[PDB]
Amino acid sequence: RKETYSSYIYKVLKQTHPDTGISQKSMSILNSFVNDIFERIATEASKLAAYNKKSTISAREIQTAVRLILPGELAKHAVSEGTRAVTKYSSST
Amino acid sequence: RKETYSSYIYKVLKQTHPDTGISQKSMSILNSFVNDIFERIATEASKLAAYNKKSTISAREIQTAVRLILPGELAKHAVSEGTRAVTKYSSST
Amino acid sequence: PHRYKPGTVALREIRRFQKSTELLIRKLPFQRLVREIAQDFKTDLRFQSSAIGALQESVEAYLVSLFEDTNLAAIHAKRVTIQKKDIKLARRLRGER
Amino acid sequence: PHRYKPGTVALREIRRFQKSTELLIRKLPFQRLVREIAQDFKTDLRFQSSAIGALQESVEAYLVSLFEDTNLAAIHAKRVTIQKKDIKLARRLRGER
Amino acid sequence: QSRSAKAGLTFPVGRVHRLLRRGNYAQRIGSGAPVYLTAVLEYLAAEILELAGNAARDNKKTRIIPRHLQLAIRNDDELNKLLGNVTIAQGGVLPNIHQNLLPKKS
Amino acid sequence: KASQSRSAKAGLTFPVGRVHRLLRRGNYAQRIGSGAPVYLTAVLEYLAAEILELAGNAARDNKKTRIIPRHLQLAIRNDDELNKLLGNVTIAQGGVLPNIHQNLLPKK
Amino acid sequence: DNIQGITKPAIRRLARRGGVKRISGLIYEETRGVLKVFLENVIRDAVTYTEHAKRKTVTAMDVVYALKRQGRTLYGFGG
Amino acid sequence: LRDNIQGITKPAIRRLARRGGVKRISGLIYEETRGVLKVFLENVIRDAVTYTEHAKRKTVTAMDVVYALKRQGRTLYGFGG
Amino acid sequence: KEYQLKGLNWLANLYDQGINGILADEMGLGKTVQSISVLAHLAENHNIWGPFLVVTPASTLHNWVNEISKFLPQFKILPYWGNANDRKVLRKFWDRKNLRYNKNAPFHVMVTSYQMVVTDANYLQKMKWQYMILDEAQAIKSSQSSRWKNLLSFHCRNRLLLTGTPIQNSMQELWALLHFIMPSLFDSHDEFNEWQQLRRLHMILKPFMLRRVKKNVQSELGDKIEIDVLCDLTQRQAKLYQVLKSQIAVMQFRKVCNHPDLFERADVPSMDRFITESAKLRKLDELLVKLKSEGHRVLIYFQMTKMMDLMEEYLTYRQYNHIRLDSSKLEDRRDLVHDWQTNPEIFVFLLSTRAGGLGINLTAADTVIFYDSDWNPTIDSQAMDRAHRLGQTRQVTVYRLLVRGTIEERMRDRAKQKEQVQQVV
Amino acid sequence: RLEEEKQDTINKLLKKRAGKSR
DNA sequence: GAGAATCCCGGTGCCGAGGCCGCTCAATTGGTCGTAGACAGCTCTAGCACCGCTTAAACGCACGTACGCGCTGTCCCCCGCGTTTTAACCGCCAAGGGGATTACTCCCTAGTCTCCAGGCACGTGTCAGATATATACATCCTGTGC
DNA sequence: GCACAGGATGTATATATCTGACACGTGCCTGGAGACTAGGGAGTAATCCCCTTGGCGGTTAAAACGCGGGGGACAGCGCGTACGTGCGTTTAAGCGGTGCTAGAGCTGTCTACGACCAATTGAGCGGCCTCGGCACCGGGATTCTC
DSSP F38-96: HHHHHHHHHHHHHHHHHHHHHHHHTT-SEE-HHHHHHHHTTSHHHHHHTSS-B-TT---
Of I70, G22, G20, nearest in space to C70 by CA? G20
Residues facing residue F32 across a β-bridge: B57
Contact E38, E7 (CB under 8 A): yes
Contact residues, A window 27-46, toward E, CB-based 8 Å cutoff: 29-30, 33-34, 36-38, 41-43, 45-46
Q: Is I25 annotated as a binding residue?
A: yes
Contact I78, I130 (CB under 8 A): no
Go through the domains of chain D in sequence order and give each one's CATH number. Answer: 6-97 (1.10.20.10)
Residue of B4, B23, B7 whose CA lies nearest to B15: B7
Instruction: Determine phi and psi for I26, rounding to 5 degrees.
Output: -70, 145
Q: Within 10 Å of residue H68's Cβ, how many Cβ atoms?
A: 27
By the 8 A CB rule, do B61 and B45 touch?
Answer: yes
For D52-86, give the DSSP string: HHHHHHHHHHHHHHHHHHHHHHHHHTT-SEE-HHH
Spell H1-11 as b/e; 16+ CB within 10 A means b.
eeebbebbeee
Amino acid at I132: M
| Contact criterion met (CB below 8 Å) for I134 and I387 | no
CATH number at residue A26: 1.10.20.10
Give the number of domains in chain B. Answer: 1
Instruction: State which residue of chain C sits closest to E100, comparing Cα positions.
Output: C75
Tell whether I32 is in a known binding site: yes
Separation CA I240–CA I235 (nearest Å): 9
Look at G78 and A32 and tell me if their CB atoms are within 8 Å: yes
Residues in F touching E24 (Cβ below 8 Å): 27-30
Using CA atoms, how far apart are residues I117 and I139, in angstroms rounded to an integer? 13
Domain ranges of chain F: 4-89
> In angstroms, rounded to a whole number, what is the distance separating the alpha carbons of residues I326 and D74?
66
Q: Which SS3 state, helix, strand or coil, does residue I193 take? A: helix
The letter for the amino acid at B40 is: R
For residues G15 and G22, what is the distance between their CA atoms, to the nearest angstrom? 9
Element counts in chain C: helices (H) and strands (E) = 4, 2
Using alpha carbons, select from H8, H72, H60 the residue that is nearest to residue D42.
H60
Percentage helix, strand, coil, to 5, in chain C?
A: 65, 5, 30
DSSP assignment of D15-66 equals: HHHHT--S--S-HHHHHHHHHHHHTTTSSS-EE-HHHHHHHHHHHHHHHHHH
Report which secondary-structure segment, H or E, holds I420.
helix I407-424
Q: H or E element: which one contains E63?
A: strand E63-64
User: Which strand (E) or helix (H) includes residue I134?
Assistant: strand I131-134
| CB of C37 closer than 8 Å to CB of C62 | no
Half-sphere exposure of B61 (CA within 13 A, CB side): 24
Report DSSP letters for C23-65, one per residue.
--S-HHHHHHHHHHHHTTTSS--EE-HHHHHHHHHHHHHHHHH
Query: What is the secondary structure of B5-47 as a DSSP string?
Result: SHHHHHHHHHTT-SS-EE-HHHHHHHHHHHHHHHHHHHHHHHH
**Is there contact between I270 and strand L, defined as CB under 7 Å from any strand atom?**
no
Give burial (CB, 10 Å; 0-12/13-18/19+) of D52: middle
Residue H24: which H helix or E strand, with range? strand H24-25
Asked if residues B58 and F3 have their Cβ atoms less than 8 Å apart, the reply is: no
CA distance A64 to H54: 7
Task: Measure D95 CA to K21 C1' (Å).
Answer: 53
Query: How remote is the C-alpha of I269 from its chain's centroid?
Result: 38
Question: Are the CB atoms for H49 and D42 separated by under 8 Å?
Answer: yes
Helix (H) or strand (E) segment spanning residue G12:
helix G8-18
Q: B60-86 as b/e, with b when 16 or more CB fall inside 10 Å?
A: bbbbbbbbbebeeebbeebbebbeebb
Which residue in I49, I78, I41 sits closest to I61, CA to CA? Answer: I78
Domains of chain H: 1-81 (1.10.20.10)
CA distance D28 to I183: 40
Partners of I79 in the beta sheet? Answer: I111
Residues 51-90 of E with CB under 8 A from F: none
Tell which residue, I381, F43, I97, has the closest CA to residue B69: F43
For residues B48 and B68, give the distance between their C-alpha atoms in angstroms, rounded to a whole number: 10
Gap from I13 CA to K80 C1', Å: 116
The string over I306-327, giving b where at least 16 C-beta atoms fall within 10 Å of a residue's C-beta and e elsewhere, is ebbebbeebbeeeebebbbbbe
F67 in Cβ contact with B21 (< 8 Å) = yes
Q: Looking at the DSSP assignment, which residues form a beta bridge with residue I225?
A: I397
Query: Which nt has its C1' nearest the CA of D7?
Result: L84
- D59 at the F interface (CB within 8 A)? no
User: Cα distance from G59 to chain C (closest Cα, Å)?
Assistant: 5
CA distances (Å), origin E57, targets C14, E52, E95, F74: 25, 9, 19, 59
Q: Phi and psi dihedrals of E87, rounded to 5?
A: -110, 160
Q: Are G17 and C24 in contact (CB under 8 A)?
A: yes
Helices D84-94, C49-76: crossing angle, 10 deg rounding: 170
Q: Is E60 left (phi over 0), alpha (psi -120 to 50) or beta?
A: left
Per DSSP, the three-state class of I25 is: coil
Tell which residue, C41, F19, E81, has the closest CA to residue B35: F19
CA distance E85 to chain C (A): 11
Q: Which residues in F lie closer than 8 A to residue H19 (C-beta atoms)? A: 96
How close is the nearest chain H Cα to the Cα of D95, in Å? Answer: 13
Question: Do F15 and B8 meet the contact criterion of CB atoms below 8 Å apart?
Answer: yes
Q: How far is CA G52 from CA C46, E87, F32, F43, G49, in A?
A: 15, 27, 18, 19, 5
The H or E element containing residue C81 is strand C81-82
Task: From I247, I271, I248, I245, select the one nearest I259 (Cα to Cα).
Answer: I271
Which residues 52-91 of chain D have a CB under 7 Å from nucleic chain L?
A: 81
Please report, in angstroms and rounded to a whole number, the separation of the first and last CA atoms in chain B: 37
Q: Please name the member of H16, H42, H61 whose beta carbon is closest to the beta carbon of D64.
A: H16
Quickly list DSSP for chain A: -----HHHHHHHHHHH-TT-EE-HHHHHHHHHHHHHHHHHHHHHHHHHHHHTT--EE-HHHHHHHHHHHS-TTTHHHHHHHHHHHHHHHHH--
**Residue type at I143?**
S
Q: What angle do CA B85, B88, B90 make, to 5 degrees?
A: 105
What is I231-295 written as a DSSP string?
Answer: E---HHHHHHHHHHHH---TTHHHHHHH-GGGT-------HHHHHHT-HHHHHHHHHHHHHHHHT
Residues of E in contact with C71 (CB under 8 A): 98
Residues in chain F: 108
CA distance I228 to I402: 7
Domain that holds residue A70: 1-93
Q: Which of I189, I193, I200, I52 is nearest to I130 (CA)?
A: I52
Q: Which helix (H) or strand (E) holds I299?
A: strand I298-301
| Chain L nucleotides reached by a protein CB under 7 Å | 8, 13-23, 30-35, 41-43, 51-53, 62-64, 70-74, 82-86, 92-94, 96-99, 103-105, 113-115, 123-126, 133-135, 145-146
Asked if D95 and E80 touch (Cβ cutoff 8 Å), the reply is no
Report how far apart, in Å, the C-alpha atoms of A40 and of each of A69, E25, E49, I348 are. 9, 12, 20, 82
3-state secondary structure of B87: helix
* A39 burial type by CB count under 10 A (0-12 exposed, 13-18 middle, 19+ buried): middle
Do B65 and B45 contact (CB within 8 A), yes or no?
yes
What size, in residues, is chain C? Answer: 97
Decide: F87 and D10 in contact? Cβ < 8 Å: no
The CATH-assigned architecture of domain I4-204 is: 3-Layer(aba) Sandwich (3.40)
> How many angstroms separate the CA atoms of A62 and A42, rounded?
8
**How many Å does it take to go from CA I378 to C1' K136?**
19
As beta bridge partners, residue I109 has: I77
List the single best residue of D8, D14, D17, D18 to mutate versus F (max F Cβ within 10 A): D18
Residue of F nearest to D60 (CA): F95
Residues 6+ apart with CB under 8 A from B54: B61
Residue C34: CB atoms within 10 Å: 23
Distance from CA of D75 to the nearest CA of F (A): 8
The answer to whether strand L lies under 7 Å from the CB of residue I105 is no
Beta carbons within 8 Å of H17's beta carbon, 6+ residues apart: D63, D67, D71, H25
Q: CB within 8 A of F55, min separation 6: which ones?
A: B26, F67, F71, F72, F75
* The residue type at B82: G
Closest CA to I284 of I373, I397, I371: I371
**Chain D: residue whose CA lies nearest to F70:** D21
Which member of F29, F30, F43 has the closest CB to residue B66? F43
Which residues of C are less than 8 Å from D79 in CB distance?
Answer: none
Residues 6+ apart with CB under 8 A from A22: A9, A10, A13, E63, E64
Indicate the fold that domain E1-86 takes in CATH. Histone, subunit A (1.10.20)
Q: Least CA distance to H45: which residue of chain A?
A: A68
Cross-strand pairs, H24? D81
Contacts of I110 (CB under 8 A, 6+ apart): I51, I52, I53, I54, I78, I80
Distance CA I154, CA I129 (A): 8
- HSE-CB at F102 with a 13 A cutoff on CA atoms is 0
Give the burial string for G8-32 (b: 16+ CB within 10 Å, else e).
Answer: eebbbbbbbbbbbbebeeebbeebb
Experimental technique for the deposited model: cryo-EM
Among candidate residues A39, A42, A38, the one with its CA nearest the CA of residue A62: A42
Q: Are I227 and I398 a contacting pair, CB within 8 Å?
A: yes
Structural contact between residues I368 and I199, judged by C-beta atoms closer than 8 angstroms: no
Residue I22 CA to its chain's centroid (Å): 18
Give CA–CA dist E87/A42, Å, rounded.
22
Cβ neighbours of residue A28 closer than 8 Å, sequence gap 6 or more: G75, G76, G77, G78
Residues 6+ apart with CB under 8 A from I305: I326
Instruction: Report d(CA I23, CA I28) in Å as an integer.
Output: 13
> For residues I100 and I51, what is the distance between their CA atoms, to the nearest angstrom?
8
Residues F31, F32, F34, F38: what is their CA dihedral angle, to the nearest 10 degrees? 180
**Contact, I303 vs I371, CB < 8 A?**
yes
How far is C-alpha H39 from the chain's CA centre? 8
Contact indicator for I76, J18 with CB cutoff of 8 Å: no
How buried is I194 (Cβ within 10 angstroms: 0-12 exposed, 13-18 middle, 19+ buried)? exposed
- Output DSSP code: residue C72: H
Architecture of the structural domain at I225-231+286-405+413-424: 3-Layer(aba) Sandwich (3.40)
CA A9 to chain centre: 13
Number of H helices, E strands in chain I: 18, 12
Nucleotide nearest to E27 (CA to C1'): L115
Exposure of G79 in the CB half-sphere (CA atoms within 13 A): 25
Please say whether the beta carbons of G76 and E89 come within 8 A. Answer: yes
Q: Please tell me the class of the F4-89 domain.
A: mainly alpha
Q: How crowded is the C-beta side of I291, counted as CA atoms within 13 Å?
A: 22
Q: How far is CA B2 from the centre of its chain?
A: 21
How far is CA H1 from each of CA D37, D42, G76, G78, H28, rounded to the nearest angstrom?
A: 12, 18, 50, 52, 21
Tell me whether residues H77 and F88 touch, CB distance under 8 A. no
Contact E92, A59 (CB under 8 A): no
**CA distances (Å), origin F95, targets C95, D17, H12, I143, I403:** 19, 9, 16, 43, 62
